[model samples]
Target: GTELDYDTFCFYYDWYGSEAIDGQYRHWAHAIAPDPNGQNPGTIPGTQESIASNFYPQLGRYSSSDPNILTKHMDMFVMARTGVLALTWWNEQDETEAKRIGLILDAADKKKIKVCFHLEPYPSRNVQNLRENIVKLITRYGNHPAFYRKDGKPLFFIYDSYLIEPSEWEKLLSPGGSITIRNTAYDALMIGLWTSSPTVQRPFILNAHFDGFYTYFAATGFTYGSTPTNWVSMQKWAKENGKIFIPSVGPGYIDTRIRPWNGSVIRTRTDGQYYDAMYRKAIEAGVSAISITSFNEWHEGSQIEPAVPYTSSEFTYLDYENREPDYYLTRTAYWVGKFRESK
Candidate 1:
């Protein structure tokens, strides 16, 4: 039942805090109470016990490196019919993060799940530095059974790719460019972010020599590329230009807890209708692949991972109501079946 022709991936975030490492909780769970430090006083309007997020995690705050938690996360992906987990990696140097990757990879492999990379934009990242990282990535984990691959090549998603100009990308991605990985063993399918406004930023992405492009934002109508109505044209354009088109879908969005001033951009989940509409739009657009905005980005309320009904001293958070916490996972399974049937 887990096997399917269509590929579905979820953007996975491993950035969470726990006292096991720092003796203090971090992220949305960092604040014990609203403005406890007197920084953003009165910003959190719900209650004094509220954390820095609109929605609260049912499992309470947890660490990313916890093996038990990671194993449970892998189970959620398998249950949701997701094929790959696109993990976010800032750089290739952190020993702790590197170890965490190994832990997840091992856990995911047991569930027959695959892992890919989401390259974060770090300060002072250049062509040379990126090339080095690429080599390190492929050399270290290329042979792992859990590493995600398509057409015999590994896959990578570059976040905020526009930070580096096309001219610079050319030197690395172009087949004939100086450090091109075209005919080399390190070559991989590189997908660039195209989440800008109505323009689609086609020229920049094409000229950059990317294998394909994807929209990463979860909030619908947040931008032209993220708007569901624009996906069909975007798909058609990708076909005409010979590039892969991946449309990202999310259950909802609400990051007001983190960015208090941007409180008006919340997108309601609509009891799973919102997610269904996004999946349908991607199917209507004839996309080969779809990416879930996130599996565990609790800070932004974009997570499709199972969440229990949680109530704290500060606030009563959103939950699946009469349904179990695994409602989204079951919903995703339904869509995956529908996608296969339509195909």
Candidate 2:
């Protein structure tokens, strides 16, 4: 509905997967693009890309894999309204997780979208057991044809491979990115980085076994000078390693609404220069897809939605808050030029 022109990129946001409390407002993802709406801004180009739904549930929220959420979201997803639907719990196989897969399979049966599974491991008992369970889950549900295919194999993804060791990599790999467990098979197509770091030595290692990658992105404040070059180098490394690099493009950062315990994560552009610079650099580097960190991270204050009109004193909305059309249109133009001229 908002006239933002982010046609060159695909907008993706994080959802907690659980239902919301009566007063909590179901996090920012609900308002801007809740389960039924499919969060399709109609400005972004593709309909086959989405972030993994967060697995952690809020204190009083409903279960993440609730059939209601899946049923509702799936309807919008199948209509070609949503591109991709990424799941957060990469390898947390439980009863709820099984139900989630069932819902996904059910929807996929009717209509299909690329379903990416994310792996989040904090405290684990045995990585070996984890891998085996993941392979089992994949074996159970990965037979579907709609999942991504590379090198004659299906696609699966992991959130943090840096934590996953090199020797263990082979045990966790498929033809392109999928892997097998105890003779059971599951295919992972891509992997996403948890955070950017110099010591983060997983990109190359992952590229050795995967086909593509994604990251959480926003370079307005902390991304001053070194980031551009770093991104260029990282993307170049990914390319050399035969991996597709999906650069992130996020808006502001603030999530006080959802987790009051945690501070805001929004990154302010302050000026168009920040977004402009980042885009130009990514395009120049010939990166794969510009995965917008969010189209609706209202809870995190990183939403790309147009800003609300200025209210009383003491608070002023940022420049583009009311001018989403301007932001998205400018990027669309940038994309057109890049596609036309870039090598």
Candidate 3:
């Protein structure tokens, strides 16, 4: 019999592509020093040496849409012994993205891994459009075998959900609000982002009617939500209020190549001990589910994905070369086992 999966999840990025597969490199050729405030579009890298990521892939630059990549990704998820992935979804119109998602769903179904959605706040995203896109997404892929639903409700993690006003969200999520999805087809467990302190987050979460909330960052002190000290309180609030709480943890973080000005927030992996502590904190706090910040978001270096030691003319990448390339994946399994035992 298979071991029980204790609802451990990881973030999955479907944003990369290669020249042979997609006719162009999508994310691997990311821009350098992109304005955090949307002031400047930033400069694009000339070659792989200048790609925005501070780490390089063990598989080399690859396409997310490739079937082999999808299979290997599912394999890694299996190695991690986690059953679910919170895949990043931008919007409904990106056909290539949709095709890649289709591939992922197919591979995940075969590999015993499931996929939920991490809905990124796309451009011009508002309450109305948000609902529409969700509807479109569900209608298109809701029936898939690996779409990842619990109790008939699909999980959706809304990234940067606070960008929209709580009052606006109430209209769609609240039971009595104007466009409520209470008993409708669009009804799903919508989780929002909660990055601020309780004084600021509580009211917004309650009023907006989010089913739960998640902390998306990897850096501990970067936000109140990601801080380990705050986990017990968040769980307390969830238990008392009948809401779910998912904590996102990561191995490390460093995006100096992409956002050079933001250098103070770098989090070192500390030879995997950092990850051990982060997982221990989340599990000890008694969380029902935990989300890894990423399985492969190399730009911010928060990936559990395998990487190699490599250096090009302009960029030298970090790696788990001292440890095994798949160190994070196996380490995740150990934490998952500990979590199951605690339960």
Candidate 4:
């Protein structure tokens, strides 16, 4: 609430599913595969196939570009009282992705929801390429009424801001450098992902001249930056340093189906208690904004998107404790209301 325009914004991954025009059932279905390690104590290690998620989506797989699907998604967000959707985007040139963004913008506009791009880590991405990409993004889509803006400037979240050096980022973020947003047509508020320890991350973000920082990981204790106990200190530091701090919270985490070797980092949902705890921390932190880890990232168990109870021949999944599939949506609305009350 500290000068931030939004209360609850959730990350949205758009790379799942496929349209009839794409000639594929669901691109994520390809990720279903037998356990590579054969250690999970399930029958037929090489024959069992499952996607990397602890729960199955209520909608199974869906086409992101489909108008009906996009409308339903927007409706759900509206019902949840979600303030913004941080959409993952790889490049501005992919026609399919562009079409999907257009559809999302249209649907979100109808719902009066704001949309911000979660700038992805594309190949060879750097300040120079990002400058061109930002130009394209702002020029082509910035005019859309649904495009999220805070303080009269567009908002962008760099997924892996640490990949680029501070020297390069200075050119774009610093007022003293070329292409500086201070007096440039491509001016925007860029939020760098803080994924490192404080020792390294603090100085890097300051030198890079980022307007703000956010923790994107859903798994608490997975990293120093993502741990709930650290959020207060992190927010305090950001405040003292004159930067906005957006804390990300998620229900849980599990990606064994994709990162089979990284199964040890799973976090329990504890029904809805885990999400509540995370949200409570964000509210108490007195930060400028709160970013949800994900609305849908079925590959990882971090999604708060609706999910139905499912049991496949190869694996068993978790459900919402006899609650409706859309329980998370209702809970989100409740949390947003609670957050506003705190302010």
Candidate 5:
């Protein structure tokens, strides 16, 4: 059973709230709500409905000048009992991000919510640091009741697992321990290798000692980009090794501001087709958990929301504004059912 979602960002909220990023004179977010009036499924096509709950300074600040903002936003999501929530952080905000994370896990444990520690790997030289950062988080929060796991272990995912190396991964999850940090024991580590290749097999090497395997990102190849070689390899590995695998699918990616960033090959799938493909793959692979890569990754343009129709850099935080759900309830419940059956 796998869960699909979008990565939510905090900076985008500031842009939308400040009007610095206007949605062509429309609501910026698309959310999953039960439409009171009709069968729009509570989702407005071509509009954004999902909302990203970003923890600034704290969780509730909404990009405002609040010193104790974390609680303000943290409580809202816990109160909503959202299907999924992702943490927003670049390299600079790790410490405060850590505090916000502590708040989320504690609240989720209390309210019975599903929250994942969204680790946004710095797509550059800081990769090593990012790995260590994850190790630090797992050693501390791995047992937090709010965290997600498979086969009785904590689940750790990389936003861009393909970009890193098997040796690098061994350093992070190596059983003997890591030379970087304390190299503590991990329950399980799952990565999103969006691309296809022999690289997708990297984690399999680790499976010999680790608990299980799961994937959170599967868009780079499978959807359209390059025939999904890496993802295909993953499925084969999962089946052959009997490792837990979760395949990711998408509606599309749209970055309006970036030249040549209008529609993505992955976004071409009708919601129905996309859903069916995602579900079928997960079931075929006997996935342990399914990840949506993001329920609201507006910045990268892979949101299910129909708000702006596309993402723009003009919005300081494209990801946050795309969190509104335009009828995610049906889709949410559908996937939940799918996962339940698999479970």
Candidate 6:
């Protein structure tokens, strides 16, 4: 197995639930409402398959708040040999998620795994609200042992940052903006998501003053940024502009259990070959850092966390049947070694 590298990041989610921890089912039985954007699929019945995910987690619908499960997750991160875990954070309003982050921080520290923030764009994610979040986030947990930092500053990945206008973001990130965090205690190495072509996205990214950009989609052809064919150019463009480009790679993609209407829905793992190819391509693009699409996103089937076969009367859950439950962890270690060698 390879040793941990702080530059390598894995997206780790903490929205799951179990009856023991949460009084009601949380993300385990999540139902997408008809959102204002009109892009989401309809809701689902909790009775179906007993969970929303297509793959059965080896942890067996474990609670995100459970210390044992949190410890186990950190142990797996040790196996994968990745240092950073980008945990999802909606806002201060998400009470359960916020509570779990505390437990996760303690567990991650036990394994020497640093925890970074993945700021999900919530309904109130305006420039004003974002500032409050940054102040609260850094002030509350900035000194935690497992909190991730680079060059003495915290790192944040802003998901769906393009949903807001570039000018709006500039107020928070740019040098002369009224609410600029530059040279302030809230200053962070913020990275933004890129979902479109380089030419279309470069100006917006630069205008927003993002220190780096990351491709969040696990499905390759779903977005220009996620497509490996364009990564070479994307990497070059970022290098020329003096911005960091971290390409995210996943073992596979299948969110049919949640979003069947999605056109670019399935990306077969082909056993481990799909993951290997994605990792290899990211390295070939000459990036100093790599981001795994997920370490435990069961709903998307992009997770590298252990999953196993399960059969219920209503549904037969898919799994890494031919491979061991921890096979992906083994493969991640190998590729991380390659990444270390390349850099």
Each prediction's whole-model lDDT (CA): 0.80, 0.47, 0.86, 0.81, 0.43, 0.87
| Tens-digit lDDT string for candidate 6 (151-170) | 99999999998898989989
The local distance difference test score of model 5 is 0.43
- Candidate with maximal TM-score: 3
Model 4, span 244-311: residue lDDT tens: 88889988888776666677888888878888898888888887688998899877788888988877
Number of the top-ranking candidate, with lDDT as the measure:
6
Q: What value does the lDDT take at residue 218 in candidate 5? A: 28
After best superposition, candidate 4 residue 31: deviation in angstroms?
A: 4.1
Any runs in candidate 2 off by more than 4 Å, and if so which? 1-82, 90-94, 104-112, 125-127, 170-187, 190-212, 219-226, 256-265, 269-280, 295-299, 303-320, 324-343
What tens-digit string does per-residue lDDT give for candidate 1 at 46-110?
A: 22256566666665666678888888888888789987999998984778888888988999899
Winner of 1 and 6 under lDDT? 6
Tens-digit per-residue lDDT, 1-343, candidate 2: 2222222233333334442312222332332233331343222111112111111111223333455644544443333133455444544445645665666656644555555454556466234665665666567766665443445554444555557665456545544324443223443454545355644555445634555666654534343212555667778777777776666655445543334333433445654455666667667767655555444443455544333343223223333543442354344345435644554
Q: Write the per-residue lDDT of candidate 3 for residues 152-225, one digit (tens) a residue.
A: 88889999999999999999998887888768988999889999989999999998999998898999889999
Error of 3 at 40 (Å): 8.5
The superposed Cα distance between candidate 1 and the true structure at residue 7, in angstroms, equals 1.4
lDDT of 5 by residue, 1-343 (tens): 2333222111112122212222231223333344233433342222222233111111211322222333444344333223445454454545544554566566545545545554555657343676566666677777777666644544544555545666665555555545433333644454443444444354434532333434443244432312333445566666676554555654444433321222342343354455456545655555555555444454445544333232323223332223343333245445556556665
Candidate 5 stretches greater than 4 Å from native: 1-89, 93-99, 123-131, 139-145, 149-152, 177-187, 192-194, 198-233, 262-273, 304-325
> Candidate 3: which stretches are off by over 4 Å?
1-6, 34-46
User: Distance (Å) between predicted and true CA of 303, model 2?
Assistant: 4.4
Q: Which ten residues in a row have the lowest lDDT in candidate 6?
A: 33-42
Which stretch of 10 consecutive residues in model 5 shows the poorest summed lDDT?
53-62
